[PDB]
From Swiss-Prot, chain B:
It comes from the Bacteria. Has very low affinity for the DHPS substrate 6-hydroxymethyl-7,8-dihydropterin-pyrophosphate, but can bind the inhibitor dapsone. Seems to lack dihydropteroate synthase activity, and does probably not function in folate metabolism. NCBIfam families: DHPS (TIGR01496). It comes from Mycobacterium tuberculosis (strain ATCC 25618 / H37Rv). Homodimer. This is Inactive dihydropteroate synthase 2.
Length: 236, 233
């Protein structure tokens, strides 16, 4: 098994980040299920800042209690929120917006937490990819120079785009290029629809994407296992 | 439109192809469901009893769907010959050329032919032997007069997606595709199959032999739209 952010993480396939939202027992169960199905990261998500803290903290606290070796990430764009979440036990900040809060890399640095760097004439269709690669690659370097450990930085070049928009599909076509930057690549492929999502997952995983943010852990795990088997089975 | 053509028949022009396996009433229904789901090919499958059952069905298929590519799943020339006479466009020789007259029957009718393949050597050795022997079988068909562009190679027939060789040939679909012959994929838990299908299609595999068309179709659609052959939805 590999380690991401000092936590045990699957070593024989791409990793799974499981989206878990509050609304309590259901949330607890959501975690239990994701772990059981092999989630490598539990990505905890949720109006206010004060109340948002009093929603994430006990949950992260509980999660860390139940699963001491589980890699926990927090889905927040606010530095104040990330601060208490890291203190509660979060290992990774998943800035789902991109860097609306300039103080965010500082927070990751202080707590020794990882950070997701996400991407929120004319020039060729190749340039569109290079324009993205450039912007996330700078986001990654700006985090590292702020004091975030290099290895704990992941890049999320195609965030929120979802299944079928031109930009989305292009970046999907060019995952290999994203991977070749040398930063671990996070994909957010989620949301009859699932066939296309799994196909994209497969392709992305085959091009070297490191992590996948999903709601359904098991379907994704089985795809990544198959990709891994196809690409890596060699003992006859 | 924008269809392209296989064996003279319209075929999805913007994704890899689907071959639907159909093996009386519930049989006709299976064809109806497959065609509606966008199956590009309907694989249909003593000689006398096999023929007298097969022929009328292919004559029905032809009449019910005049522009549908039809393949016959048989290993004997006699049965194949009777199937092509009924309307079959493609001989799906599922046993890899047990009957030596098979390519003669395909040539006679101007039918297409699937050159199928079904091993303690090296990893590269398997791939090379499979390629070697499907590639030589295809060239054998063209020598017998089968139209070059109506030949399909079936490198991994029945290989089993979860067996070691099945995974080996999946990893090397590119090598199969690189031979220049159109590659049919035909192996028999759902997400792994759809994963393999996704990977084979992006590597340029031409056709997929399946039982359930819809799910495979969606996978091929996505691959095609990722590679820019289909538009964004």
């Amino acid at each position: 098994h590999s380690t991401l952010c000092g936590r045990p993480v699957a070593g024989d396939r791409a990793l799974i980040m499981a989206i878990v939202n509050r609304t309590d027992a259901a949330a607890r169960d959501a975690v239990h299920r994701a772990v059981a199905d092999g989630a490598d990261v539990i990505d905890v998500g949720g109006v206010d800042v004060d109340t948002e803290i009093t929603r994430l903290v006990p949950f992260i606290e509980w999660l860390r209690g139940a699963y001491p070796d589980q890699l926990i990430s927090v889905d927040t764009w606010r530095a104040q929120v990330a601060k208490a979440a890291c203190a509660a036990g979060a290992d990774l900040i998943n800035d789902t917006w991109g860097g609306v809060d300039p103080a965010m890399p500082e927070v990751a640095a202080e707590f020794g937490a990882g950070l997701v760097c996400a991407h929120t004439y004319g020039t060729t269709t190749r340039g569109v990819v290079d324009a993205v690669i450039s912007q996330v690659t700078a986001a990654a370097e700006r985090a590292v120079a702020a004091g975030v450990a290099r290895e704990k930085v992941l890049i999320d070049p195609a965030h929120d785009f979802g299944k079928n928009t031109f930009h989305g599909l292009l970046l999907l076509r060019h995952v290999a290029d994203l991977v070749m930057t040398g930063w671990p690549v996070l994909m957010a492929l989620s949301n009859e629809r699932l066939e296309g999502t799994l196909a994209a997952t497969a392709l992305a995983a085959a091009a070297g994407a490191r992590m996948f943010r999903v709601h359904e852990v098991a379907a994704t795990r089985r795809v990544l296992e198959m990709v891994a088997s196809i690409q890596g089975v060699r003992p006859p």
